[PDB]
Design a protein around this ligand. Structure first.
Ligand code: ATP
Ligand code: MG
Lengths: 377, 309
């Protein structure tokens, strides 16, 4: 288990192994045992990640030889293990640079996430509670527009690759099948099944109306099943809060399943059956490809390096905040200067600028009013 | 010198379809110096359950007697909301409360599918169209959460703090992390919160610090106030639950009865600044709210922000 940047540099004992991949991402609360690492150690049946052991977004991997499957864990600012490093560092070393900081990280994961959709078969996001964050309806809707822009660039970086034909046309192994994991959080504690089947009814309707789960399983960046689980809910457990476990034992000394939920999907990729998720008034054919370790890194490595990605990145929710902030400030510049010893009078108009409008960049736009007044007289 | 009236259950100030209800002046008086308390939060955090325990209920009471109706297992098992708009209530001490419609609620959006850019953008407007109201007609605002650090919420408040109509009135704010666990009470983690909340709201302009210090309320007995660089207004609320053998377990945190009794005090003992520039009574406040509401729907900043999406 090492970073991906340190893995792509080279394999001989397992170069030829029909495998799968799993992308993990999402939000996580502030705790020692993250909901992502414990997800791996629970599936692999071992203690992979030992307990108690400029950029803030990274990704690491792990290869399970006993199951022929690889994992990828996106760790961006959304989590708290990395968000703390930012706030802490930002505490030692304004209203403008900050907007560029938080916005840069908001972009750094967006593209990092894209790289996960183009090289994964399956991928499951997490959320510490039920009631999935509706904000994803925009993230996935905006990210799609970004893929279509860089798609002609990524295929070139994998042109001279042994992946295949379908791969080179769409840059993905197959349209992934997204999943969902939700911690219970002390709620209800069958009841769960009634909840799982409800969220599915929601997510489908929420996304379907957004036109992100179209009929064609090729245009959509992530599919959803029709006759399967598609979601899981982690119930409470004494494993978390380890110190509280001993105290529960000390008092005694003195006096479906997760794997089965993820294996039913992996059994279809390893068996080469593929994901046939297209039931929108007429079925369609979805490509597929089961690569090998040495054959997968060939593309991911060339795809992990990719200025070109910045062309469509800077162009394609911090951006919307700068727009209303620039317009609200610009609109107030004319009503302020046009309505206007001089230090007392010029400062008087400045008092109206505060009540007129402001924004994340209003402190900079005010210079146009001050300079425009200082030049007058 | 008889009394005015007595309220036993909440009423509705705003219809479920954004419409003002004038069925509340029959419970207000003409006196001044009133307190108002608003609430913001996600779907099932426990905001309707908190305003009740602070207004007139107690923990010993049953969930069926809360002035603000809470969630029932009939909906938790299928996903859903229970507030549906904005409520209203007054206590013996003449304190106003205002529960609210969830923020970024899928159940609301799910209901809209079965009934003007997109329903997603419309819902994104309602919240700001609500949050902007509370930030204009309230003294305190209780931001409830089920877990910790949901950036999608901190990056939402500023959007609301730059959408209201109109030195300027910036109300107070409170961060209440409901459903807290033992780990959330260790001081090594307590300081991490205050550090994160301050850096994420350093330029929020809201009053989120210098008040409601849970550190001096006897929660953490041996901690000196110099342990935190900036003690923001944050609070915690937990999850409700011969002699040696009968000892309880190490919960590791104060009882839900204690903490609630402390918040009921600190919130009731908050400041009561002047919203408008006229010493207004309890009745003129109502008329003022109607004036803001009519100025929030048919506004400019909201519509402009709507088109950007
Ligand atoms: N600290 C806590 N301990 C135990 N149960 C809690 C706690 N906080 C909230 N709950 C429970 O969580 C549920 C939340 O229901 P509540 O009425 O608070 O919903 P709400 O916040 O108004 O949500 P919505 O706006 O979607 O209706 C209730 O069953 C309540 O008893
Ligand atoms: Mg409610």
């Amino acid at each position: 288990p090492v970073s991906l940047r340190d893995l792509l540099m080279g394999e001989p004992p397992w170069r030829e192994d029909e495998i799968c991949v799993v992308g993990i991402f999402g939000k996580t609360a502030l705790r020692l045992n993250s909901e992502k690492f414990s997800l791996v150690n629970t599936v692999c049946d071992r203690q992979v990640f030992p307990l108690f052991r400029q950029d803030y977004s990274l990704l690491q991997a792990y290869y399970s030889q006993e199951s022929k499957v690889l994992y990828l864990l996106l760790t961006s600012i959304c989590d708290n293990s990395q968000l703390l490093r930012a706030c802490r560092a930002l505490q030692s070393g304004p209203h403008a640079e900050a907007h560029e900081f938080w916005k840069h990280q908001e972009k750094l994961q967006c593209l990092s996430l894209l790289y996960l959709f183009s090289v994964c078969h399956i991928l499951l996001l997490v959320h510490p509670t039920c009631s999935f964050d509706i904000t994803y309806d925009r993230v996935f809707r905006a990210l799609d527009g970004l893929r279509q822009k860089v798609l002609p660039l990524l295929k070139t970086a994998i042109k001279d690759c042994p992946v295949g034909k379908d791969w080179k046309l769409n840059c993905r192994p197959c349209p992934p099948r997204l999943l969902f994991l939700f911690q219970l959080n002390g709620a209800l504690k069958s009841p769960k099944r009634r909840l799982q089947h409800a969220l599915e009814d929601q997510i489908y309707r929420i996304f379907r109306k957004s036109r992100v789960l179209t009929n064609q399983s090729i245009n959509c960046l992530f599919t959803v099943p029709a006759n399967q689980a598609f979601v899981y809910i982690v119930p409470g457990s004494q494993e978390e809060d380890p110190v509280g476990m001993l105290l529960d034992q000390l008092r005694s000394h003195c006096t479906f399943t997760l794997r089965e939920f993820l294996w039913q999907h992996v059994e279809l990729v390893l068996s080469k059956k593929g994901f046939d998720d297209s039931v929108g008034r007429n079925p369609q054919p979805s490509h597929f490809e089961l690569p090998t370790y040495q054959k997968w890194i060939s593309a991911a490595s060339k795809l992990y390096e990719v200025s070109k990605i910045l062309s469509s990145i800077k162009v394609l929710f911090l951006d919307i905040d700068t727009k209303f902030s620039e317009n609200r400030c610009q609109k107030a510049l004319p009503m302020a200067h046009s309505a206007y010893v001089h230090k007392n009078q010029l400062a008087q108009a400045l008092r109206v600028y505060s009540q007129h409008a402001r924004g994340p960049a209003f402190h900079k736009y005010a210079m146009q009013l001050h300079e425009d007044c200082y030049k007058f007289w | 010198l008889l009394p005015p009236e007595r309220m036993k259950h909440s009423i509705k100030l705003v219809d479920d379809q954004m419409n003002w209800c004038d069925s509340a002046i029959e419970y207000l008086l003409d006196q001044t110096d009133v307190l108002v308390v608003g609430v913001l939060g996600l779907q099932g955090t426990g905001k309707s359950m908190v305003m009740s325990l602070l207004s007139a209920n107690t923990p010993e009471e049953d969930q069926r007697t809360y002035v603000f109706r809470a969630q029932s297992a009939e909906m938790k098992e299928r996903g859903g909301n229970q507030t549906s708009g904005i409520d209203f209530f007054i206590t013996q001490e003449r304190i106003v409360f205002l529960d609210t419609q969830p923020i970024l609620s899928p159940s609301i959006l799910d209901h809209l599918i079965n009934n003007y850019n997109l329903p997603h953008t419309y819902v994104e407007m309602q919240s700001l169209q609500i949050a902007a109201f509370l930030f204009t007609v309230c003294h305190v605002v209780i931001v409830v959460q089920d877990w910790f650090t949901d950036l999608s919420l901190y990056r939402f408040l500023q959007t609301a703090e730059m959408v209201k109509p109109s030195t300027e009135y910036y109300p107070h704010l409170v961060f209440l992390q409901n459903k807290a666990r033992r780990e959330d009470f260790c001081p090594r983690k307590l300081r991490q919160m205050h550090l994160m909340i301050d850096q994420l709201m350093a330029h929020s302009h809201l009053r989120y610090k210098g008040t409601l210090s849970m550190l001096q309320c006897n929660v953490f007995p041996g901690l000196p106030p110099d342990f935190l660089d900036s003690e923001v207004n944050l609070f915690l609320v937990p999850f409700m639950d011969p002699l040696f053998s009968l000892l309880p377990g190490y919960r590791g945190h104060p009882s839900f009865q204690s903490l609630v009794s402390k918040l009921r005090s600190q919130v009731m003992s908050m400041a009561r600044p002047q919203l408008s520039h006229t010493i207004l009574t309890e009745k003129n406040w109502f008329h003022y709210a109607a004036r803001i509401w009519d100025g929030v729907r048919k506004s400019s900043a909201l519509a402009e922000y709507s088109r950007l999406l």
